[PDB]
Design a protein around this ligand. Structure first.
Ligand SMILES: Cc1ncc(CO)c(N)n1
Ligand SMILES: Cc1ncc(CO)c(N)n1
Ligand SMILES: Cc1ncc(CO)c(N)n1
Ligand SMILES: Cc1ncc(CO)c(N)n1
Lengths: 217, 215, 217, 213
């Protein structure tokens, strides 16, 4: 309840309907429980890796237009940090699961992936810096909160790769990317209302992305 | 209309295009049986589209690899403010909707996605790849007209007929024709351009469906 | 006197130092007087078409993120109304002087040209829409004011091409362009201070451009 | 040896002027007046910010995941490497980040920053890299040439400034950027105009910093 401090708290609360569906999504619950079929995870990894590449490009775009040096530093940190944290982890997860980077490059993105990646890049290439951040926040934050909610099931999760995947989102370093991004938005000088459309769309794509990964769309 | 790279693209997208061509929204629209509320809903959505479409052409224009290609991109763009957009401005007014209503209409999810796809592409990808993403949007509407044009003669609704007149017009067809020749002169293969032509085509299908369900 | 009004008037008056140097530049005075050596004009035409081409692209970029349909409609007009006007005539100015569009494509831009074109494109790709307009205004406005100042010497100007060149910048269609550009900025709600850096740099480039054209750089 | 070697050789006339520039020679020797260094730090810090933005743009358009990573590592390594140093240098010399934000860029700086951002937002990825290479590489080579004068350079800040360009980590950014270009699939000739313009700006930038513009 105390995360509901400022602008970003307001945004999170407005998206509660969406986020509760994300938090309660069967893909998520199964993944953390250890019951998710490995083929679905494989399919998810292929899709999500492509999303991360394009997510890094989106951060790059936002960085190209940061209204201050510090803000530019934050976006770059989020971008290199995405390559150095998540993507490195994914690269290793693919390898352990018998998928190559070439397989990744050859995996066709599903429709939601195309649309979501498009939305983030479009926004980050054309909208105000803080609007971009608002569009990028749900991606970062939802994954942390998902972890914060289903973390307990990991101790009973028999699958090693699912646990390794989840470890990033429980890590203080990842929660710090989240905290840092929220701090940027809470001090942006802009209202929750101005930021809402961006935060909302991205949140809706996060829900469709999990669904798409669940039904191997 | 199957003689070069764009013909190759069209034929590879046949599965998708046939679904578009046979979509109930389209058939009803040309037949004159489409409920006015669905048309209104469609007009609101499509304006936001066209505005963003214009921006996409602008972006593509911004890095045409030749003056000619830029001049082209740029015409299609301005010609989208005074060509399709002008028309739509009237069509709305006749239906009792203001530009303000247009500005206030929330785009549906497909519209957001599609607009994002075109702008994203046009801001980032090679000029020809952008054109390949933009072609289905232009061409499908011409072909839709080429297919359902006959029903207009029996179509009792004036606004639907006025809407359709643009896509039957030689000026629109020529636009389409020129756009193809740009691509067919690109010197790139179909498979290089396929992904872009495909996605856009898929969006066109989802757009009609979204307009049909009042999404 | 009545170009003293609002934000753009403020900008003009701050750039007075720079603008008076432009308005009194020998290239300009000789061009209107009819004394400018044809070779310098030819050189100028080669450079300036490359400019106009890139100017068009810059408008296109600004258009790409106009914050309103009206503002966008404008940008798009200038960008196309630059292929349609200025660029169209220039094509005739060159043909008359025995230079082809191919010659234009092959003319290497001088360093100022490169720099200026880069500045406009860079700005229009990255900066706020109004900031872009502020960068673009000097280019438009200086040429009108140059005409407003040296227009009288045209009746005594024996060179037809120079007079044809000048006719655009005396035309109500061009002068109005400037008027609309100014009103766009004057209604922005942005201060002079915020727009100054962009107006200034462009103005400095206009001065260097004339100098470069004068010395055959 | 490869495409980038070809580029360097073609720009030899320009680079020898950069390598022999009095600003550079004085900076490494320790004879550069502190006011000129201060003036340079203000200008160059602004340049590095915009240089990072340029790399960001080029990254947004990398034709491969790996290429996107390289640009990203260059951009971020520019923040955490060179920019962090300049921040320490500015502070040690009594200049704030605010002073930096308020410093008006000189004409060459505006033009050079514009060139890089223009290119990186609109040209092919490898053309961008060709535009960015001279910036990175010239500084390494300058260091490679004037490094010896440092041992006896009495000025600490000049030495600290130079330390980055002698460092294996900075040379690695350079080597990695060359390798990207050497295997780009493109000719020296296609890349030349970009490498050249940047090189010419590097020379004007030093001159501008020397004359206090
Ligand atoms: C679709 C998606 N959203 C968010 C994340 C976490 O940044 C991810 N890896 N993938
Ligand atoms: C969605 C859509 N596609 C194409 C056109 C015609 O360019 C249009 N008006 N709307
Ligand atoms: C350099 C220059 N500036 C302005 C104009 C007028 O837009 C022009 N034609 N050339
Ligand atoms: C002007 C300039 N060129 C190159 C470097 C090295 O990246 C720098 N810091 N500044």
């Amino acid at each position: 309840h105390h995360h509901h401090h400022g602008v970003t708290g307001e945004l999170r609360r407005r998206a509660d309907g969406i986020w509760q569906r994300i938090l309660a999504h069967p893909f998520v619950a199964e993944l953390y429980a250890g019951t998710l079929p490995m083929e679905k995870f494989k399919y998810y990894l292929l899709q999500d890796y492509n999303y991360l590449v394009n997510f890094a490009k989106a951060l790059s775009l936002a960085a190209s237009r940061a209204p201050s040096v510090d803000l530019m530093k934050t976006a770059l940190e989020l971008a290199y940090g995405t390559v150095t944290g998540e993507m490195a982890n994914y690269e290793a997860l693919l390898k352990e699961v018998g998928l190559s980077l070439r397989d990744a490059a050859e995996a066709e993105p599903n429709r939601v992936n195309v649309s979501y990646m498009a939305y983030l890049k479009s926004t980050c290439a054309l909208e105000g810096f803080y609007q971009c951040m608002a569009a990028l926040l749900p991606c970062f934050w939802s994954y942390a909160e998902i972890a914060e909610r289903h973390g307990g099931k990991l101790r009973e999760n028999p699958v090693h790769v699912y646990k390794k995947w989840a470890s990033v989102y429980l890590s203080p370093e990842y929660r710090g990317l989240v905290e840092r991004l929220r701090a940027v938005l809470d001090s942006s000088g802009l209202s929750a209302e101005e930021l809402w459309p961006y935060f909302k769309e991205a949140s809706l794509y996060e829900l469709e992305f999990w669904q798409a990964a669940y039904e191997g769309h």
